Design a protein around this ligand. Sequence first.
Ligand SMILES: O=CCCCC[C@@H]1SC[C@@H]2NC(=O)N[C@@H]21
Ligand SMILES: O=CCCCC[C@@H]1SC[C@@H]2NC(=O)N[C@@H]21
Ligand SMILES: O=CCCCC[C@@H]1SC[C@@H]2NC(=O)N[C@@H]21
Lengths: 608, 608, 608
Amino acid sequence: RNITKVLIANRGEIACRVMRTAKKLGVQTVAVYSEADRNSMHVDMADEAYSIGPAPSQQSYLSMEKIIQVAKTSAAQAIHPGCGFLSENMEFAELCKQEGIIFIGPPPSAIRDMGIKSTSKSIMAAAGVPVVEGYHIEKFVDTPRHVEVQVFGDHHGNAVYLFERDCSVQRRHQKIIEEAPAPGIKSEVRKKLGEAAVRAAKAVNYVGAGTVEFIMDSKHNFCFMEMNTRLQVEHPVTEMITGTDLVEWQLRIAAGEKIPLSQEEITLQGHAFEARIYAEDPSNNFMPVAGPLVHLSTPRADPSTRIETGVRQGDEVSVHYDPMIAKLVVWAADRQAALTKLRYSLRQYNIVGLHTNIDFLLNLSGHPEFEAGNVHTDFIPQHHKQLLLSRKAAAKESLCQAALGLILKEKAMTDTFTLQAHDQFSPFSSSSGRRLNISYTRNMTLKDGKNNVAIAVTYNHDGSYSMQIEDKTFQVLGNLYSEGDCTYLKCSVNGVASKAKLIILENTIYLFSKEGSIEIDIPVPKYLSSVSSQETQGGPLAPMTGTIEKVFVKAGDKVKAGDSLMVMIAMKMEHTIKSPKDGTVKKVFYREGAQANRHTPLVEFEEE
Amino acid sequence: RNITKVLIANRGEIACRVMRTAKKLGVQTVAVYSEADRNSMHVDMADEAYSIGPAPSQQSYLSMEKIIQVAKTSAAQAIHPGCGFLSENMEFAELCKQEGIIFIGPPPSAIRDMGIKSTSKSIMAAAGVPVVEGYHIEKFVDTPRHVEVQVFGDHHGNAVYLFERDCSVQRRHQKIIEEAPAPGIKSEVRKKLGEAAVRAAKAVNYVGAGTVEFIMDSKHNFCFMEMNTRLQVEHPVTEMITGTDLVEWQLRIAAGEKIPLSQEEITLQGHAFEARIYAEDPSNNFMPVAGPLVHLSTPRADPSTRIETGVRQGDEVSVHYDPMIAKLVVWAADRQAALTKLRYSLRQYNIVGLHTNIDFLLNLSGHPEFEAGNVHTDFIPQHHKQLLLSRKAAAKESLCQAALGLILKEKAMTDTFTLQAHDQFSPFSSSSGRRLNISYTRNMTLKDGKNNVAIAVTYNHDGSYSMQIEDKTFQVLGNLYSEGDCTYLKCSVNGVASKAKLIILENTIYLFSKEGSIEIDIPVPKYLSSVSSQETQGGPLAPMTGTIEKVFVKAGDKVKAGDSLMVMIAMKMEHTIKSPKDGTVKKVFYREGAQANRHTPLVEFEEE
Amino acid sequence: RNITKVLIANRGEIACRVMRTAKKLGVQTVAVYSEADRNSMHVDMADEAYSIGPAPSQQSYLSMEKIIQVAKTSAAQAIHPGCGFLSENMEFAELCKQEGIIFIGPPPSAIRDMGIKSTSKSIMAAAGVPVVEGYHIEKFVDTPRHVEVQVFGDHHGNAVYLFERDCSVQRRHQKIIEEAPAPGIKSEVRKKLGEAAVRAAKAVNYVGAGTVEFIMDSKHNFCFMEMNTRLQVEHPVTEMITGTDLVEWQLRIAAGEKIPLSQEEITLQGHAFEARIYAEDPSNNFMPVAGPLVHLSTPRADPSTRIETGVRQGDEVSVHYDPMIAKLVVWAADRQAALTKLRYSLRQYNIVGLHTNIDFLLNLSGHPEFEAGNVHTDFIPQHHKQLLLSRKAAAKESLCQAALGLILKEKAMTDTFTLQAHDQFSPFSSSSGRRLNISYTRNMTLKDGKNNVAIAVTYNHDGSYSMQIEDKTFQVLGNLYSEGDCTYLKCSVNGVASKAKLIILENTIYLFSKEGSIEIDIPVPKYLSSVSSQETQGGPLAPMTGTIEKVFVKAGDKVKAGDSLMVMIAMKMEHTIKSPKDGTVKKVFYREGAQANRHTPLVEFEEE
Ligand SMILES: O=CCCCC[C@@H]1SC[C@@H]2NC(=O)N[C@@H]21
Ligand SMILES: O=CCCCC[C@@H]1SC[C@@H]2NC(=O)N[C@@H]21
Ligand SMILES: O=CCCCC[C@@H]1SC[C@@H]2NC(=O)N[C@@H]21
C-alpha cells in the first residue's frame, strides 16, 4: 500500500519525531492540533495542519471521530498514533481499519490481548515466557530492577529483537533515566532473553514495534511483566546502539514491506543513555510545574547528542498536556564515556522560567552506585538523601563575576544609547568611570541567598577592576561576547580565566558555567517596591485548576492557622487548603463539586 | 602523464560538472567561452577562461583551431570535450594527438568506427553482439524500448560494465526521463547483457567511457542498436547507483592509470531516476522557448538529490545553444520511493520567465503505466492524451490566499516607507485599516483564468481578515517570512494552515505549494493601460531568427486571413507565416534567402 | 583511572590539538600560560586557564613546580605534556607520579633509558634492533635516508607499530617535509622493520606513543638511530594514513585501557604529506624571524586538508618560543595526487608581516628528485642551487591588474564616503572619470622591483579601462567582491579572465593568484616622506635580544667600514656587529656580559 501522506494523531516531540522521518522518506505530513497547540512546533513543521477543538485532550487528541474526519478530509492514507493518547486504543485501531485508513501500529487484536494483565500473562505463559509475580496479600517475589526488550514484528509474522534497555531508575514508576544495553547482562543472556520474547511475538503474530517488559533479579533470572503494544518513549537509546530508525520501520511495515535487516545483519556498537527532562520540582516532592520557557538554551547537537525537543524558547508548558520538556540521549564507545558526555551536556542545557529535574539528573548520573551500574527500581527511594541536596554559599570569585557582568551590562546599555546620538565619539560616552587626580570606587551590594554581600569596585585606568569583598582583594577584567543568541562573559579573576553564559532577568543574575550555575539577586530599592502593597490575602489560592472535593468551613467559622478549609483534586493529585490566619471566615467563594481555576480566591476572611 | 591542468572544450552544466571533479582532484581548470557566455557560471568557476569568438557555435565551440590555440596558450596538458560539440569529432581527437595534447576520451579510431552505422553494426556482429534491425521498405522488428549499458575501457584494453539504464521514455527520440537500473531486468540477464557488450569493447580496445545502446523486446531479448563514443548526458543515474564518478575515471584513464575497481568490487545498491528540465512548451507541441530565468528557485540538494544546473537566476536561455535548463537525479532504497522523492522535489523547483516541461514531467512520473515500469519508446505518443491536460478553476481558498498575499505585500511596502521616516512610531504607519465605531470592508477583484472574482475583505480588530466570496465566508490570518531569498506566506483559512512560496511579478500572483502552483491575475486599471495602443500590426513577426525559404506574396497582392505569406526555417524547424487580415499587401520587407531576426516586420499592409 | 579533567602542560598548536581531542571525549581542559601567551588561542580554547609567570620558558613552561601547583589547584587528574618542554623530562614524570597525577606519556624509566645515546643503543642492540653508526675520527658509510616508525605501547606491555614516515628532507637536521608511508619501502620490508622495533618496545615495556628513528641506506638496510620518547611533531601524517587519533590513544592508555585495535584490524589506505610553516627567511640562510601576522589567510580545510594552526591573524611570533606558524598535511589516493593538492593548497596560504619558508616549500615540493621520491638527509644542501631562486620581472598584465586594483580601491573609498552624505545619488559620487567631449587619461606610476613603470589609463564610457604600457595596449575590466574576510579582484585583461586576492597594505599592492603572488610598490611622494630624516645612525642595532660575548672597540678608537665592533649570542646563534662608517668611535653603550635588547644603540660615533 503506497503511503504518500500520513496523519500524525499526536503532539509535541513525538509528532516532530515522526514528521522528521516521514519528510526524510518524501511522505507528506498532516498535523492535528488543539486550540492551545495552534502555534506548536509540530503544527509549523507539518505540510498541512487541522484544528481538532479545545485544549482538553478528551475533546481534542482523544476524539477518535475528529481524528478520522481529518484523515478523510486531508486524504491521509495512514495514521501514526505516536505514543500515549490513541496509540493503545483498540476501538480507534479498528475504526481506522473500518474506514480504510492504515493504522501504523499493531493490529486491534494484539492491543486488546495485551491491554488486560490476566489475558496477557496467560498468553505469555503459553508462549514459554515466564509468568511469575507477587499479587494481592501482595508481596513481590522480585521487586527490584527493570529490563525491557525492543521487539519488531511484521504482517508476515517474522519477528526480531533489538537487545535490551535498563529502565530501573524510576520515581513513582515514572522512568527517569534509561540505558541501552542494560549493564551486566551478557550478550548470550540477552540473546536467550530476546528469543523467549520473540516466540511470544510470533504467537500473537504482532505487527509493528512491541516491548516485552521483564523483571530481572540479582542473579539475572527474568520474568515477563507486561508487553507495551506501542513505540516506547525511550526507543531512542535502542536506535543509538543499533543505528536503526524504528519510526521508519513502523511506516515501511505498515505499508506491507518485509523487515529490512536479518537478525544476522543486526550488530551492536557502543553504549547509550537517555535522561528525560521534566517540568518538575524535585525539592518539592517532584510536583509538576507549569509555566513559560523564558530561557531554553540547549547543548549543540552532534550525531551522539540528540535533543528530542517539542518546545522552543517562549513556549508555555500546559496543565492539560504532559510536563516533559525534552529528552537527551548520547552514544559512546564506552558506557563510562557516555555518562561523562551526558553530564557535560546537561550543564550546557539551561532552563529559566520554571523548575526542572535537570539538577536531580546531574546528581543521579554522578551517584557512585549509578556509575557502578548497581541499579534497581528502589534506587531513587534508597538514595533520596544524596540525590536531593541544599544550596551552598557562593565563592567570592562568583560574586566578582556577577558584579563584572552587571557593570558590562551597564556598559552595553551606554553603547546602545550612544548609537542613536549625534555625538558618537564624545568621551562622556565611555564607561571608564574616570576622575581627575583620584580613582572612582563604587559601593555595590549583591544578595547571595539570604546574605547581603558588599563589594567595593574600583575603576582602574587600564580598564580593569579592583574588587574588595570583606578583607580579600580581587583583580577582575573581562568582556562580553555573543555566540549565537546567548551572551557570554569572558573574565579573569586574580589571573584565573573562565567563560560563562550570562543572563540578567528581572533582579537575578544567572551565570552558567561548566563548573555549575549560580544565581545572584540585585537588591530592589524600597521606593521602586510598591510601598504598602495590599495585605489581607483571601485564603491559599488553588494550587491548580481542579474539582473541589471537600469543604470544611461554614459561612461564619472561627479557624486557626493550619485548619484545613478545602480539599481539591487536580489531574488526580490531592491538595488540602489550610487556614493562613486565625481570623474568622467572612465568606466562601466555592462549594463542593465546583471547578476552581488556578489562583482564584477560595475563602474571604473578616477584616480585623 | 601528469594532468595538472585541463581545458574544458564545452559550456553550461557539463563544463561545471567536469570542473567540479577536476578541482576536487587538485587539477587546474581552463574554460572557453563565446561572447554570449562571457558571464556564464562555468567561466566564473574556472581558474582561467578564454574567449573563442562570437555566439554561433560553428564560429566558437566547434572551432577546433581556436580550442587548440587556447590549450597551447594556457599550457593545458589535456582537453575534456564533455558531451556534444567536438566530443565525437574524430578530426579534433587526432588534432589533439598531433599537438601533444591529451584528448580525455576514446581514440580517433574508435570515434570513426562507431560514427558510421554500417561499420559499427559489422564490428558489433563480429564481436558477438546481435545485429538485427528493420531498415529501408522499413519496418522495425522491435520499435519499443531503449536499454543502454555504461561501459568503461582503458588504454591497457581491460573493459568493465556498470549495469544498465532505461531511456525508453523519449519524445521525438529526445530522452526525457532516464532510470537506473532498468526495471524488470534480472541481475543475471543484465550481467549477460553487459558481457556481450564488454567483448565488443575489448574488440575495439575502447579507451574511456562508452555506451552500448540496445533495443530490448517484451521478452527481454536484446539487440545492439549503436555505441555512443562519449559520456552520456544521463550518466548521473549510473553514478548514483554505483557510487562512482565517471568524469574522475575519464581523467585518471586519460592520464594512463588502470581501472580503479575490479568487476567483483563493483556492487549495486538502490534505484535512481533522472528528469531533464527543458525550456519547452509541452502544450504547444514541445516547441523550444528562449528567454530570461526571472525566477529559478531550486529544491535543496542532499546526497540523493543532485541539481545539475549550468544556469542561475537572471540567466537568459540562448537560441544558439541547447534549451536544457537543468537535470534532476535522485537515489533511493526502492524505485517507488525514488519516484515519490523526485515528484516532491519537482514541486519545489520553480521556473518563471519562460515555459518548461516540469508539469509534463510531473504528469509523466505520476502516470500508472510509468509507476508500474511498463515503459517503451512509444510511451509518450500512446499516453499523450493524459500526460497533457488543461487548466482547472481555482478553489476559493486559493483566492483567499492570493488576496492575503497582496494585502501583506502592501503592508511590507508600508513598513519599507516607514523605515525612512522620522515618525517611526505613528499609528498611521500601521496596516490595521481601522475605523471609528465601524469596520472597514475592502472590495477586491482578482482574475482566475477568464473569470473575475469579487472578494469582500473585512479588516478585523484582532488582525485577522474575514473574506466573502459569493455566498461563502472565510476567516483568514497569516504573515510573511523569508527563507533564504524566497518569501513564504504562512496562512490559515477557516482553521486550515498551510505554507506556500509567494511571488508577485507584474500583475500576476504566483503561489507555490506542495499541493500545486496557482497563478492569479491582478486587473490592470484602464487608465494605466495605454489608451489607443497602436493598431495595424505589420504581419506575424518571425517566430525566431531564421532563413526565409519561401515567399508567396508579390508587392501588391490581395490576401485573406490564413493565406500563407512566407516560410522560415529556424534551427531546422519549419514555420509558415499566415495573413493576419484580409487587407491587400502594401510591401514586403524580406526576399527569399534573407535571414530575418526575431520579431522583425515581414509584410506591410495598406492602411484601410 | 577516570580522566575527567586534563591539564595541558604546553602552548600553541599542540595545546589546541590535545584540547580538541579532550573536548571530543567530554574531558575538561586546563591550559597554562605565560604573560606573553595571555591572549593565545589555547587559553581561549580551554575550559580553565592559569598564569605560570613571565614570558621566558625557563620561568614558565619549564617550571615543574608551577605546573604541578596548577594541576593540584585545578584538580586535574592527568597532565598531557605535548611535545618539547617537559615531555621528555624524567624528573617531571616522576614528580607527577609522586603527586598522584597521571603523566600522559611513557614511564620515567623509559624516558631516562632513551635520553642517553650509549644506554639507548645498548638496550636496542640487546633487543635485536641494529646498533651500527659512525662515531668520533667520525665518518659514515653514505648519506642517510631518514625513516622513522610510529610505535604505540600500553601499561599491559602489548606493543603495535603504525607503518613508517620519511623525514629525510631536513635543513640543519630540522625536519621540513615529512611523508607517510616512506616511498619505495615495500609493505613486507616495513612489516619486518616495525617488528624488530616492536620487540624493543616490549623489552622496555614502553607505555604510550614512541618513535623508533632509523637510518636507511640505498639498499633499504636499516639501523636504529634513536627512540624519541614522546609524540612526534609529524604524527599527523601517520594519523592521515591510518585514520587513528594518537592523542586519543595516549589519553585512553594513560587511563589504563587496552590498545583499541589489533594489528590485524589496522589497514593502510592512500599516501599523506606534511610541510612545516616556519617564520624563517630562506634567502638569508633560514634565519628565524619574529613579528606580527598582519595577514594570515589560510586554505579552506577539508578532511584531507588539515591546518594545524596555533596562531591567528594579528598574533605576534615570539623570540622566546619556537618560530613555527602552522603545519599543513594532506591525504590522497596516490602520492603524486597528494603532492599536487599540497602545492595548490600552499598557494592559497597567505602570510604578510614576516618572512616565511612557504615559497621554499613550493620550490622543494616541485623539485624533480622530490617528485621521484629520491630523498636523503643531504637533499637540501645538494639542491640548494635550485630550491632558492631570485625574483623575476613582472608581466605587463600583472601591472594592469595592480592598477585596476588601485582604481577599484579608490572607487570603494568613494562609495564609503558617499554612504555618509545626505546626497547619496549625485552623479559626482560616481567613479566614471567622465569629461565633456573628451576622454580622461590618467598617468599612473608603479614600481616593480627597482623599475618604475608608467601606465596611461583611459576611463572608457562603458566602464572599462584602456591601459597602455610602453607600446602595448590592454583592455581591462573588473570588479571587487568579498569572500569571507578576503577581498577578491575579478578582472579580464585583453579578454583573459582571472581571479586573485587583493591586499593593499602601506604602499605595496599584494596580488595572490594560483599562478603566483606579485608585489607592486606605489611610489611615495617626496613631500609625504619626511624631508631630511635624521642621519648618523649609531652603529648596527642588535639583531636580537642577546648577551654581549665580545667587545672589540675602546672608548676612542678609529674604525673602518667592516671592522667588527661586538659579538652577540642570541638563542645560541652568533652575530658579529660591523662598523657602518670610517668615523672614530665616540662611546660604547654596552660592555661584555651585558644583555642588549633588540634595536638598542651599541656604539656612538663622533659627529663629522
Ligand atoms: O482513572 C484514571 C486512571 C487511574 C485511576 C483509575 C483507577 S486505579 C483503581 C481502579 N482500578 C482501575 O482499573 N481503575 C481505577
Ligand atoms: O544537417 C544537419 C543534421 C540533420 C540533417 C542532415 C540530413 S538528415 C538526411 C540527410 N542524411 C544525412 O546523413 N544528412 C542529411
Ligand atoms: O645547551 C643547550 C643545548 C645545546 C648546547 C649544549 C652543548 S652541545 C656540546 C655540549 N655537549 C652537551 O651534551 N651539551 C653541550
